Amino acid sequence: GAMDYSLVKALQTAQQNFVISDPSIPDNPIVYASQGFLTLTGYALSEVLGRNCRFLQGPETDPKAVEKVRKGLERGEDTTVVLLNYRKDGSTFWNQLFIAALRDGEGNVVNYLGVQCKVSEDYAKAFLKNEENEK
Numbered sequence: 001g002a003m004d005y006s007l008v009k010a011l012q013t014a015q016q017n018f019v020i021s022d023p024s025i026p027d028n029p030i031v032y033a034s035q036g037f038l039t040l041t042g043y044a045l046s047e048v049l050g051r052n053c054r055f056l057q058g059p060e061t062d063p064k065a066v067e068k069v070r071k072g073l074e075r076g077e078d079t080t081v082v083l084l085n086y087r088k089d090g091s092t093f094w095n096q097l098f099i100a101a102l103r104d105g106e107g108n109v110v111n112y113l114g115v116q117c118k119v120s121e122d123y124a125k126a127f128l129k130n131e132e133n134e135k
Ligand SMILES: *[C@@]12Cc3cc(C)c(C)cc3N(C[C@H](O)[C@H](O)[C@H](O)COP(=O)(O)O)C1=NC(=O)NC2=O
Pocket: 019, 020, 021, 028, 052, 053, 054, 055, 056, 057, 066, 067, 069, 070, 073, 083, 085, 095, 097, 099, 112, 113, 114, 115, 116
């Protein structure tokens, strides 16, 4: 199960916000979220399970950031983005998102692991500007 991954347990020891998705199910829904994640977003575990994590996006979320994630998952690439996300109550925060595939011995992606770090506006501002400049 989700907590049997050694890196999941590792992340738990620092109380990091993370989710696990199951890409073998249509639309790659979340199948575990840490307590940190549930508190950040304002949802109960049972509510988040079964949803694709795009439910944290909204009108001011940059579609180009979201497309970086989609492509990374498509192309088999680790991805890190900063993007605007939305809590259950509609209030927003900046989310630095770290995504990687968890693979079996043949390279088949068995789950995705996604770590979320809430970051300040100023940090998001500077990260995105550096991203854009470096690009
Ligand atoms: C989540 C974090 C997250 C973790 C993991 C493991 C996955 C697989 C996805 C996500 N989120 C992105 C979303 O699931 C989807 O991949 C993207 O929207 C890209 O595809 P679409 O163009 O939407 O079809 C998340 N997105 C968030 O905004 N916030 C999160 O916490």
